[PDB]
Amino acid sequence: AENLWVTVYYGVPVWKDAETTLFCASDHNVWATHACVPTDPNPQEIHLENVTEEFNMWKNNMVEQMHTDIISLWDQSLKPCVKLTPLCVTLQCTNVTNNITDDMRGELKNCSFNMTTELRDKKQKVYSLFYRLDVVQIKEYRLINCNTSACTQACPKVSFEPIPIHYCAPAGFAILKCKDKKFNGTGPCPSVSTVQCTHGIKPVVSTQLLLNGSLAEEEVMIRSENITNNAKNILVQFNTPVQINCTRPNNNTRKSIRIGPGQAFYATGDIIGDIRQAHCNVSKATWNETLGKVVKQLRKHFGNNTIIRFANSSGGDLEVTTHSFNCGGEFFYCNTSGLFNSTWISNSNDSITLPCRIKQIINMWQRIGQCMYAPPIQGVIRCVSNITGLILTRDGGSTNSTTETFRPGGGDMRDNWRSELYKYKVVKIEPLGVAPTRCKR
Amino acid sequence: NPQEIHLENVTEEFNMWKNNMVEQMHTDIISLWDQSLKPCVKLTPLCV
Amino acid sequence: IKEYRLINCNTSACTQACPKVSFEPIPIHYCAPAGF
Amino acid sequence: AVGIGAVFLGFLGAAGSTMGAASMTLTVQARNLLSTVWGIKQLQARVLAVERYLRDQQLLGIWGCSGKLICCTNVPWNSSWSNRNLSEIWDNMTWLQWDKEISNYTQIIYGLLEESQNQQEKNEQDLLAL
Amino acid sequence: AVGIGAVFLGFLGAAGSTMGAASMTLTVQARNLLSTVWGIKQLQARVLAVERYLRDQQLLGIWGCSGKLICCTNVPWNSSWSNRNLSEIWDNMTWLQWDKEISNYTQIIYGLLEESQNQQEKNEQDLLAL
Amino acid sequence: AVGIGAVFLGFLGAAGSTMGAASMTLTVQARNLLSTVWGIKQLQARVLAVERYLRDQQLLGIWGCSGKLICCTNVPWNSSWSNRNLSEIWDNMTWLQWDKEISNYTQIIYGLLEESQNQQEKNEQDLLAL
Amino acid sequence: QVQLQVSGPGVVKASETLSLTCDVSSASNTRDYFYWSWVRQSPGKGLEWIGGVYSNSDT
Numbered sequence: 004a005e006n007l008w009v010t011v012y013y014g015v016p017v018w019k020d021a022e023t024t025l026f027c028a029s030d031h032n033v034w035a036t037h038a039c040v041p042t043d044p045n046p047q048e049i050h051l052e053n054v055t056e057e058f059n060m061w062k063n064n065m066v067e068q069m070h071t072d073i074i075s076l077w078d079q080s081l082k083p084c085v086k087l088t089p090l091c092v093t094l095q096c097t098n099v100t101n102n103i104t105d106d107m108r109g110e111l112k113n114c115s116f117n118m119t120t121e122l123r124d125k126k127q128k129v130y131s132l133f134y135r136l137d138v139v140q141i142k143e144y145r146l147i148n149c150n151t152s153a154c155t156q157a158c159p160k161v162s163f164e165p166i167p168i169h170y171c172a173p174a175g176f177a178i179l180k181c182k183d184k185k186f187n188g189t190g191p192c193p194s195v196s197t198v199q200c201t202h203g204i205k206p207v208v209s210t211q212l213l214l215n216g217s218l219a220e221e222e223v224m225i226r227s228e229n230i231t232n233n234a235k236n237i238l239v240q241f242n243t244p245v246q247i248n249c250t251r252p253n254n255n256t257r258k259s260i261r262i263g264p265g266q267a268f269y270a271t272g273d274i275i276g277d278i279r280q281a282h283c284n285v286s287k288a289t290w291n292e293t294l295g296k297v298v299k300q301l302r303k304h305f306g307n308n309t310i311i312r313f314a315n316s317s318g319g320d321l322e323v324t325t326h327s328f329n330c331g332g333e334f335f336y337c338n339t340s341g342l343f344n345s346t347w348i349s350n351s352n353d354s355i356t357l358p359c360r361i362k363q364i365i366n367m368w369q370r371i372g373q374c375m376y377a378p379p380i381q382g383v384i385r386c387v388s389n390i391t392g393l394i395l396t397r398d399g400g401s402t403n404s405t406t407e408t409f410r411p412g413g414g415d416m417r418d419n420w421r422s423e424l425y426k427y428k429v430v431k432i433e434p435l436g437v438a439p440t441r442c443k444r
Numbered sequence: 445n446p447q448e449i450h451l452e453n454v455t456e457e458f459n460m461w462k463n464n465m466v467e468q469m470h471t472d473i474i475s476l477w478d479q480s481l482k483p484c485v486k487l488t489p490l491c492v
Numbered sequence: 493i494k495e496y497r498l499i500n501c502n503t504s505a506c507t508q509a510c511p512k513v514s515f516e517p518i519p520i521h522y523c524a525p526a527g528f
Numbered sequence: 529a530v531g532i533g534a535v536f537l538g539f540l541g542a543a544g545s546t547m548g549a550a551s552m553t554l555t556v557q558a559r560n561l562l563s564t565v566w567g568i569k570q571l572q573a574r575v576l577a578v579e580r581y582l583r584d585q586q587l588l589g590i591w592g593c594s595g596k597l598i599c600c601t602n603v604p605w606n607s608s609w610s611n612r613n614l615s616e617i618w619d620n621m622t623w624l625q626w627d628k629e630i631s632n633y634t635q636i637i638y639g640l641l642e643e644s645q646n647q648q649e650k651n652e653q654d655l656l657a658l
Numbered sequence: 659a660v661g662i663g664a665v666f667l668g669f670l671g672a673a674g675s676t677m678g679a680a681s682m683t684l685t686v687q688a689r690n691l692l693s694t695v696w697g698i699k700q701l702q703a704r705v706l707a708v709e710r711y712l713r714d715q716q717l718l719g720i721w722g723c724s725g726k727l728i729c730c731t732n733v734p735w736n737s738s739w740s741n742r743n744l745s746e747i748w749d750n751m752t753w754l755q756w757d758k759e760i761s762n763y764t765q766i767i768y769g770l771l772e773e774s775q776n777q778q779e780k781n782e783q784d785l786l787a788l
Numbered sequence: 789a790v791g792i793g794a795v796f797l798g799f800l801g802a803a804g805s806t807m808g809a810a811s812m813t814l815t816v817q818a819r820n821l822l823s824t825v826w827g828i829k830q831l832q833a834r835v836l837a838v839e840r841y842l843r844d845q846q847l848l849g850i851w852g853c854s855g856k857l858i859c860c861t862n863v864p865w866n867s868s869w870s871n872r873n874l875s876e877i878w879d880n881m882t883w884l885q886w887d888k889e890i891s892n893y894t895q896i897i898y899g900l901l902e903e904s905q906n907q908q909e910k911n912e913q914d915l916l917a918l
Numbered sequence: 919q920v921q922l923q924v925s926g927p928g929v930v931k932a933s934e935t936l937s938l939t940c941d942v943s944s945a946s947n948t949r950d951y952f953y954w955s956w957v958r959q960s961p962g963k964g965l966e967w968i969g970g971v972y973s974n975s976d977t
C-alpha cells in the first residue's frame with residue numbers, strides 16, 4: 004500500500020571525488036601568469052553547513068597536477084634561451100687568492116678558455132670565475148655537466164621570484180576547502196566550504212625548510228601519512244614564522260661575452276672588494292622556542308616520556324643534504340648543521356649563522372640529463388624569508404631505546420606543494436537524482 | 445553570394461584607432477610569417 | 493670588420509626563406525563565430 | 529525578528545540540508561553547470577563541461593523530462609531499491625546519503641525509465657492515430 | 659501573386675525598430691544563432707559559439723521557457739525596475755535602449771524567474787501527488 | 789516456453805529488423821550518440837561530434853519535436869514520395885531500405901516540416917496575443 | 919563574509935553634528951538586502967540601539 008514512483012530531480016546538491024585539470028588564475032617571469040584567467044575581485048567562498056567530508060592530503064591529485072604544471076612552466080621558460088653547448092671545453096684554472104677569507108680557500112677558480120665568436124672562423128681567449136662545485140679536474144678542468152648533457156643558460160630577463168597561483172576547477176566541478184583547524188590532513192572534516200578557486204600559493208622551491216608558506220592558525224601542526232612508519236616524511240607547519248636573512252656579500256661583476264650570432268654568455272668577471280662566504284642568519288631564541296613547540300607536538304605522537312633530538316641530515320646529494328633554495332637568481336645550498344643539533348629532556352641578540360655555497364650549474368627537479376646555468380647577479384644580494392615549516396625524517400625506529408632522532412629532509416617538491424594543498428580537494432557534481440514520491444505522471 | 449543586411453533605423457559609434465580586428469590581424473600575420481619560415485634551412489654557418 | 497661580414501651576424505642568425513613558398517598577398521576574410 | 533534582511537545560499541549551501549529543503553535550490557546548482565600550457569587545458573575543460581552537460585540533458589530528454597527540474601515518472605518504486613519510508617527520506621537525510629545508498633541501482637532505474645518513456649511514446653502515437 | 663518579389667527580412671533588421679515591431683522578427687534572429695594558425699582558432703571559435711548557444715538554451719530552460727520565442731511568466735514586474743508605461747516602451751523605444759535601461763536589473767529578474775520556475779515545478783509535483 | 793529468461797538487444801541489433809519492431813529500440817541508439825598532435829585530432833573529433841548532436845537536436849526543435857523520440861507532425865504524406873501501404877512499410881522491410889528509398893525526398897520533407905512548424909508557432913502566438 | 923568598518927572624527931565639539939560612516943564589504947555578489955543598525959555603548963554602561971535601515975528600501 005505504498006504506491007511510490009520514481010521522480011527525477013535535476014540540480015540536486017551531490018558530488019563525488021574526481022580528477023580533472025585545474026586552470027591557473029593570478030592577480031617576464033618563469034611562472035607564466037600572462038596566459039592565466041585574471042582572478043575575480045571578490046572570491047566566493049560558500050560554507051557547507053551539515054557537511055562532513057573525507058580529506059586525504061597524501062593521495063591528492065592536486066599535488067601531482069601542480070608538480071607537473073611547475074615542471075612544464077620551467078621547461079617553457081627555459082626553451083627560448085641560449086644553449087651552452089660551446090661552453091664545454093678544456094679550462095686552464097688557477098686558484099682565486101685575491102682578498103679571500105680562510106673559509107673561502109679554493110671555492111672559486113679563475114678559468115681561462117678559448118670560445119667561439121660571431122664568425123665561425125674566429126676564436127677568442129676569455130676568462131671567468133667558476134665555483135668549485137661547478138668545475139671538475141680532467142690545472143686541467145671541465146664543467147661538471149659536460150659528461151652528462153648540455154646546459155641551457157637561464158635568460159636574465161625572466162625573474163625567479165615566486166608569484167601566487169590560484170587553481171580553479173572547470174564548470175561542473177567544485178573545490179572543497181576544509182576550514183577545520185588543527186587538521187591532520189587525513190580523515191573526516193566537519194567544517195567544509197566550497198571555493199571557485201584556491202588561495203594564492205607561491206611555488207616556493209626549498210629543501211629542509213618551507214619558506215614563505217602558510218602558517219597554522221592555532222598551534223604547530225604535525226602531519227604524516229603513517230607516523231609510525233619511519234620511511235614516510237613528516238610535514239611540520241609552524242604557527243608563527245621564523246625570520247631568516249640569507250646574503251651573498253660578494254660584489255660580483257657580470258661580463259657578457261658573445262659566443263655566437265645573437266648568443267651571449269654571462270660570466271663572473273671579478274669580485275669588487277673583499278670575498279667572503281654567503282651565509283644565512285636565524286634568530287636563536289625564535290628557533291629554540293619553535294623547536295620546543297615542535298618537540299611538544301611530537302611528544303603527543305611518540306609518547307610524553309620519550310627523548311626528542313634533532314641531528315644531522317643522513318646523507319646524499321647536496322640538494323637533499325643541505326637546505327637548497329634561490330635568492331634573487333643565485334642558488335644557495337646552506338649547511339643546516341647548527342639548526343638540527345640538540346636534544347630535549349622530558350622534564351639574547353646573538354643569532355645562528357649557517358654557511359652557504361652558491362652554485363651556477365643547477366638541477367632543480369629529480370631528473371638526469373637536463374641542467375641549467377644561472378647567470379651571476381650583479382653586486383651584493385640579500386633576502387629575508389619566513390621559515391613556516393619543516394620536512395623531517397625519523398631515523399631507525401627500534402624499540403630498544405626510548406630516544407627518537409629527527410633529521411631534515413626534502414628533495415621531492417611534491418611534499419612542498421602538499422603543505423599548501425592539504426586542505427583542498429576536487430569533486431565532480433552530479434545534478435541528476437532519482438527519488439521515490441507519491442506523484443505520478 | 446555574400447549576404448549583406450542594411451540595419452535601417454540604426455546608428456552605431458565606431459572607432460578605427462582602437463579596433464581589436466587590427467591587432468588580431470597583426471598577430472595572425474606575424475604568426476603566419478613565423479610558421480612559414482620554420483621548415484627550411486637556418487643559415488648559421490653563413491657568418492664568416 | 494676588404495674584410496666584410498653579414499650585418500645580422502652580431503645581432504642574430506638569419507633563417508633562409510623557403511624557396512618554394514610564395515610571398516604573393518592573397519585576400520583574407522576575417523569572419524567571426526556564430527553568435528557574433 | 530523585526531530588523532532583519534535576507535541572504536540566499538550559494539552553489540552547494542543546501543548539500544547538508546534535507547532532501548525537501550534542498551529541492552528548492554535545484555536551479556542554483558543547475559545554472560552553474562556550464563560556467564599552450566594553459567590554452568589546451570582550458571579548451572579541453574570547456575569541451576568536457578559541454579559534453580557532461582549535454583549527456584545529462586540527453587538522459588533527461590530520453591526519460592521524457594526535458595526542460596524540467598522536477599519530473600514525475602510512471603516507473604514504480606519497488607521495495608528492493610530502498611525499504612525506507614517517505615517520512616525518513618524527505619525529512620531525515622540529505623541527497624549525498626541518498627547517492628551513497630542507491631548507487632548500485634542507478635543503472636537499473638535509468639533503464640526502466642528509458643523503457644517506460646519508449647512505451648509511453650508508442651502508446652501516445654497509437655492513441656493519436658484514433 | 660504572379661508579379662511580386664521576395665523581400666527576405668534580414669538578421670538584426672529590426673534593431674532600430676520599436677520593441678513592438680521588433681518582437682515580430684524574433685525568428686530571423688533565433689534560427690541561425692549556432693551556425694595551422696587558422697584551424698586552431700577556428701576550433702575555439704566553434705567551441706565558443708557552441709558553449710554560448712548552450713548557455714542561452716540552459717537559461718531558457720531553467721525559466722520554463724524552453725523552445726519558445728515569447729514566454730509569459732508568473733513573476734510580477736516590480737515598478738522600481740522601470741516606471742515607464744507599456745505604451746511608452748512598446749511604441750517609443752527600441753530593444754537596444756531597453757537593454758541599456760535595465761542592464762543593471764537583469765540578474766535579479768533572472769533569479770526571480772528561476773525561483774518562480776522551481777516553485778511552479780514543486781506546485782506541479784504537489785498537484786500530481788493527489 | 790517456461791523458464792527462458794530475457795536478454796535485450798544492444799546498439800544496432802534491430803538494424804535488420806522491421807521498422808515497427810525497430811521502433812522499440814530508439815532509446816538504445818539515442819544514448820550512444822554522445823559516448824599533443826593526437827590531442828588536437830581527438831579534440832576536433834569530439835567537438836565535431838558535439839556539433840552534429842546539437843545539429844540533430846536543433847533540427848528536431850525547429851519541428852517542435854524537442855525531447856520526443858517519436859513525434860507526430862501535421863505534414864501530409866504525398867503519394868509520390870512512396871506508394872507503399874503501411875503494412876508493407878512497417879512489417880516487411882527495415883529502416884535502412886526506407887532511408888535508401890526516401891533519400892531523394894529528404895530535404896524537401898524537412899523544409900515542409902520546418903515551414904509547418906513556423907506557421908504553427910505563428911498561429912499560436914497570434915492566438916495567445918488575444 | 920560581510921565585514922564592517924567604522925570611521926569618523928575621534929573628537930567632536932559640543933552642540934555640533936557627529937557624523938559616523940560604516941562601510942560594508944561583502945564577498946557575495948548575488949542580490950541580498952541586509953538590515954544595518956547603529957549601536958552605542960557608553961563607558962561602563964549597557965549597549966543602546968540608535969536606529970537601523972534596510973539595504974533595499976527607505977524603511
Ligand SMILES: *[C@@H]1O[C@H](CO)[C@@H](O[C@@H]2O[C@H](CO)[C@@H](O[C@@H]3O[C@H](CO)[C@@H](O)[C@H](O[C@H]4O[C@H](CO)[C@@H](O)[C@H](O)[C@@H]4O[C@H]4O[C@H](CO)[C@@H](O)[C@H](O)[C@@H]4O)[C@@H]3O)[C@H](O)[C@H]2NC(C)=O)[C@H](O)[C@H]1NC(C)=O
Nearest residue numbers: 162164165207214215328329330331380381385386387388
Ligand atoms: C620570500 O619573500 C620575500 C619577500 O617577498 C623575498 O625577498 C625578496 O626577494 C626579491 C627577489 O628575490 C627582492 O627583490 C629584489 O630586490 C632588489 C632590491 O630592490 C633588486 O636588486 C631586485 O630587482 C632586480 O631584479 C629583478 C628581478 O628579480 C628585476 O626585475 C629588476 O629590474 C632588478 O634587476 C636589475 O638589477 C640586477 C642587479 O643589478 C641586474 O642583474 C639585472 O640585470 C637588472 O639590471 C629585486 O626587486 C626583494 O627585495 C626581497 N624582499 C625582501 C623583504 O627581502 C624572498 O626571496 C622570498 N623567499 C623565497 C625563498 O622565495
Ligand SMILES: *[C@@H]1O[C@H](CO)[C@@H](O[C@@H]2O[C@H](CO)[C@@H](O)[C@H](O)[C@H]2NC(C)=O)[C@H](O)[C@H]1NC(C)=O
Nearest residue numbers: 098099100101113114115130131132272273274
Ligand atoms: C683572473 O685571471 C685574469 C687573467 O688571467 C686576470 O685578469 C688580469 O688582471 C691583471 C691585473 O688586473 C691584468 O694586468 C691583466 O691584463 C688581466 N688579464 C686579462 C686577460 O684580462 C684577473 O684579474 C683574474 N681574476 C682574479 C679574481 O684573480
Ligand SMILES: *[C@@H]1O[C@H](CO)[C@@H](O[C@@H]2O[C@H](CO)[C@@H](O)[C@H](O)[C@H]2NC(C)=O)[C@H](O)[C@H]1NC(C)=O
Nearest residue numbers: 092093094095114115116117118126127128129
Ligand atoms: C687556446 O688555443 C690556443 C691555440 O691552440 C692554445 O695555445 C696552444 O696550446 C697548445 C697546447 O699547450 C700548444 O701546443 C700550442 O702551441 C699553443 N698555440 C698557441 C698559438 O699559443 C691555448 O692554450 C688555448 N687556451 C686555453 C685557455 O685553452
Ligand SMILES: *[C@@H]1O[C@H](CO)[C@@H](O[C@@H]2O[C@H](CO)[C@@H](O)[C@H](O)[C@H]2NC(C)=O)[C@H](O)[C@H]1NC(C)=O
Nearest residue numbers: 214215216218243244245246387388389390391
Ligand atoms: C612573514 O611573516 C609575517 C608575520 O606573519 C608577515 O607579516 C604579515 O603580512 C601580512 C600580509 O598579508 C599582513 O596581513 C599581516 O598583518 C602581517 N603580520 C605581521 C605580524 O606583521 C610577513 O608578510 C611574512 N613575510 C613573507 C615574505 O612571507
Ligand SMILES: *[C@@H]1O[C@H](CO)[C@@H](O[C@@H]2O[C@H](CO)[C@@H](O)[C@H](O)[C@H]2NC(C)=O)[C@H](O)[C@H]1NC(C)=O
Nearest residue numbers: 189227228229230231232233234235400401402
Ligand atoms: C604504518 O607502518 C607500520 C610499520 O611498517 C605498519 O605496521 C607494519 O605492518 C607490516 C605489514 O606487513 C608488518 O609486517 C609490520 O610488522 C608492522 N609493523 C609495526 C611496527 O606495526 C602499519 O600497518 C602502517 N599503517 C598503515 C595504516 O598502513
Ligand SMILES: *[C@@H]1O[C@H](CO)[C@@H](O[C@@H]2O[C@H](CO)[C@@H](O)[C@H](O)[C@H]2NC(C)=O)[C@H](O)[C@H]1NC(C)=O
Nearest residue numbers: 248249250251282283284353354355356385386
Ligand atoms: C649575520 O650575522 C653576522 C654576525 O653573526 C653579521 O656580521 C656582521 O655584519 C655587520 C653588518 O651590519 C657588521 O657591521 C659586523 O661587523 C659583522 N660582524 C661579524 C662578527 O661578522 C652579518 O652581517 C649578518 N648577515 C645578515 C645578512 O644579517
Ligand SMILES: *[C@@H]1O[C@H](CO)[C@@H](O[C@@H]2O[C@H](CO)[C@@H](O)[C@H](O)[C@H]2NC(C)=O)[C@H](O)[C@H]1NC(C)=O
Nearest residue numbers: 246247248249283284285286287352354355387
Ligand atoms: C633580519 O633582518 C631584519 C631587517 O631586515 C632584522 O630586523 C631588525 O631587527 C632588529 C633587532 O635586532 C631591530 O632593531 C631592527 O629595527 C630590525 N630592522 C627592521 C628593518 O625591521 C632582523 O633582526 C634580522 N634577523 C636576523 C635573524 O638576523
Ligand SMILES: *[C@@H]1O[C@H](CO)[C@@H](O[C@@H]2O[C@H](CO)[C@@H](O)[C@H](O)[C@H]2NC(C)=O)[C@H](O)[C@H]1NC(C)=O
Nearest residue numbers: 314315316317318319324325338339340341344
Ligand atoms: C654531520 O656532523 C658531523 C660532525 O658534526 C660532520 O662530520 C664531519 O664531516 C667532515 C666532512 O665530511 C669531516 O671532515 C669531519 O671529520 C667530520 N666530523 C666528524 C666528527 O665526523 C658532518 O659534516 C655532518 N653532516 C653534514 C651534512 O653537515
Ligand SMILES: *[C@@H]1O[C@H](CO)[C@@H](O[C@@H]2O[C@H](CO)[C@@H](O)[C@H](O)[C@H]2NC(C)=O)[C@H](O)[C@H]1NC(C)=O
Nearest residue numbers: 315321324325337338339340341342344357358
Ligand atoms: C656543516 O657544519 C658542521 C659544523 O661546522 C661541519 O662539521 C665540521 O667539520 C669540520 C671539517 O671541515 C670539522 O673540523 C669540525 O670539527 C666539524 N664541526 C662539528 C661541530 O662537528 C660539517 O662538516 C659541515 N658540513 C659540510 C657538508 O661541510
Ligand SMILES: *[C@@H]1O[C@H](CO)[C@@H](O[C@@H]2O[C@H](CO)[C@@H](O)[C@H](O)[C@H]2NC(C)=O)[C@H](O)[C@H]1NC(C)=O
Nearest residue numbers: 051052053054537541542543544545546549550
Ligand atoms: C542542519 O541540521 C540541523 C539539525 O541536524 C537543522 O536544524 C533542524 O531544523 C529543522 C527544520 O529546519 C528543525 O525541525 C529541527 O529541530 C532542527 N534541529 C535542531 C537540532 O535544531 C538545520 O536546519 C540544518 N541546517 C541546514 C542549513 O540545513
Ligand SMILES: *[C@@H]1O[C@H](CO)[C@@H](O[C@@H]2O[C@H](CO)[C@@H](O)[C@H](O)[C@H]2NC(C)=O)[C@H](O)[C@H]1NC(C)=O
Nearest residue numbers: 450451452453454671672673674675676679680
Ligand atoms: C525607422 O523609423 C521610421 C520612422 O522614423 C519607421 O517607419 C515608421 O513605421 C511605422 C510602423 O510601420 C509607421 O507607423 C510610421 O509612420 C513610419 N514612419 C515614417 C516616417 O514613415 C521605420 O519602420 C523604422 N525602421 C524600421 C526598420 O522599422
Ligand SMILES: *[C@@H]1O[C@H](CO)[C@@H](O[C@@H]2O[C@H](CO)[C@@H](O)[C@H](O)[C@H]2NC(C)=O)[C@H](O)[C@H]1NC(C)=O
Nearest residue numbers: 797801802803804805806807809810879880882
Ligand atoms: C529476419 O528475417 C526473417 C525472415 O525474413 C524473419 O522471420 C519472419 O518473422 C515474422 C515475424 O517476426 C514472421 O511473420 C515470418 O513468417 C517470418 N519469416 C520466416 C521466413 O521465417 C525474422 O523475424 C527476422 N528477424 C529479425 C531479428 O529481424
Ligand SMILES: *[C@@H]1O[C@H](CO)[C@@H](O)[C@H](O)[C@H]1NC(C)=O
Nearest residue numbers: 096097098099108109110142
Ligand atoms: C687551490 O686551493 C685548494 C684548497 O686550498 C688546494 O687543494 C689546491 O691544491 C689549490 N690549487 C692550486 C694552488 O693550484
Ligand SMILES: *[C@@H]1O[C@H](CO)[C@@H](O)[C@H](O)[C@H]1NC(C)=O
Nearest residue numbers: 139140147148149150151152
Ligand atoms: C661524470 O663524471 C663524474 C665525475 O667525473 C662522475 O661521477 C659521473 O658518474 C659521470 N657521469 C656520466 C654520465 O658518465
Ligand SMILES: *[C@@H]1O[C@H](CO)[C@@H](O)[C@H](O)[C@H]1NC(C)=O
Nearest residue numbers: 185186187188189190191228
Ligand atoms: C588524523 O589522522 C590520523 C591518521 O589516521 C587519525 O588517527 C587521527 O585520529 C586523525 N585526527 C583527527 C583529529 O581527526
Ligand SMILES: *[C@@H]1O[C@H](CO)[C@@H](O)[C@H](O)[C@H]1NC(C)=O
Nearest residue numbers: 253254255275276381382383
Ligand atoms: C659594487 O661595486 C660597484 C662598482 O665598483 C659599486 O658602484 C657598488 O657600490 C659596489 N657595491 C657595494 C655594495 O659595495
